[PDB]
Design a protein around this ligand. Structure first.
Ligand SMILES: [Cl-]
Length: 372
């Protein structure tokens, strides 16, 4: 793992826990890497308390880790993510939208693009309709039509908007068969069910029951170099599971590549998290950059500037296999013994971890696959 990976994992937990505290009856899905990288990039146009709040709010202890190490960490992570031959189906973008008429520092726009692969734009925020359409149409192009009408309301006074999007439709190394998917109960609570398409495969899985977490733990690899890890808590143990997750625990799971016989039920779902990062990151202690006090002098030298709007949109599809064009053919040997049936048919927590850095690309919880 990279040197900033542990801070990223702690950030993931802090933001997840915040979101879990905010509601227990909604699906959660967000990108820790995506949000952190966007605010690491923003921090380059900041100074002092404004700057320090962002990095401390991303779980860096600035009396401990040098700022340069933080940035080459995000850099290195943005290098493995943006491989030419990635194979990982990961569309991600950062849109900086600043009012026209501000004289922008060249080096900030130079740092943004040719270090953090973000996009900077000068727009007339005088007309909300033009500015909103400019913002949504950029996200439309960037996701290739997968995210539309993202921004619902822009303020009249908005001078600076950050939009952060991510769509992920993964291809399983060891995929499910479409023919075996059938509609089944998902237990949204102890007495209520909902119908979901349930994917099913008898095979050899990295799957075990962890008594410490009171959870079943499933790891499945994606094409590209990322791993989905699913935690299915015993009854009454969801909150325990949320409380007890650590990065060292996830690391231990990824280090074991043992497989056992199992009949797995995993729902086919599409989930999205839409987050107001001003609200949400404000709760983690990032307030100055969003206020009149903000020192954004690395973005514009003479004029007062604050971050008016910051939005995260995360979209995920889980299916049998996110592409219908193959080549790699294999054979798992199932022993004669009767396999456990393990069904992810009630609320569960997940992470997608990029393999080279051990970064948490995504974290989420499914409470109701039909909750949209
Ligand atoms: Cl796998």
């Amino acid at each position: 793992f990279n040197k900033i990976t542990p801070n990223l994992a702690e950030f993931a937990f802090s933001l997840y826990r915040q979101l879990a505290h905010q509601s227990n009856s909604t699906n959660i899905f967000f990108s820790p890497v995506s949000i952190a990288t966007a605010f690491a990039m923003l921090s380059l146009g900041t100074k002092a308390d404004t700057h320090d709040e962002i990095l401390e709010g991303l779980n860096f202890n600035l009396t401990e880790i040098p700022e340069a190490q933080i940035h080459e960490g995000f850099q290195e992570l943005l290098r493995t993510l943006n491989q030419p031959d990635s194979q990982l189906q990961l569309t991600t973008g950062n849109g900086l939208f600043l009012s026209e008429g501000l004289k922008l520092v060249d080096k900030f726009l130079e740092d943004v693009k040719k270090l953090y692969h973000s996009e900077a734009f000068t727009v007339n925020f005088g007309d909300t309709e033009e500015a909103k359409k400019q913002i949504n149409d950029y996200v439309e192009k960037g996701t290739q039509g997968k995210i539309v009408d993202l921004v619902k309301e822009l303020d009249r006074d908005t001078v600076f908007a950050l939009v952060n999007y991510i769509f992920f439709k993964g291809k399983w190394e060891r995929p499910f068969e479409v023919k075996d998917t059938e509609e089944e109960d998902f237990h949204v609570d102890q007495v209520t069910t909902v119908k979901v398409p349930m994917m099913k495969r008898l095979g050899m899985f990295n799957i075990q029951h962890c008594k410490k977490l009171s959870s079943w733990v499933l790891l499945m690899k994606y094409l590209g170099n990322a791993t989905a890890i699913f935690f299915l808590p015993d009854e009454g143990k969801l909150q325990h599971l949320e409380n007890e997750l650590t990065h060292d625990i996830i690391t231990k799971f990824l280090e074991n590549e043992d497989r056992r016989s199992a009949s797995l039920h995993l729902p086919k779902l599409s989930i999205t998290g839409t987050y107001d990062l001003k609200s949400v990151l404000g709760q983690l202690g990032i307030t100055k950059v969003f206020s009149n006090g903000a020192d954004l002098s690395g973005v514009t030298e003479e004029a007062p500037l604050k971050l008016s709007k910051a939005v995260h949109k995360a979209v995920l599809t889980i299916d049998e296999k996110g592409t219908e064009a193959a080549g790699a053919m294999f054979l798992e040997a199932i022993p004669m013994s009767i396999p456990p049936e393990v069904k992810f048919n009630k609320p569960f927590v997940f992470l997608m971890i990029e393999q080279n850095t051990k970064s948490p690309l995504f974290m989420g919880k499914v409470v109701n696959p039909t909750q949209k």
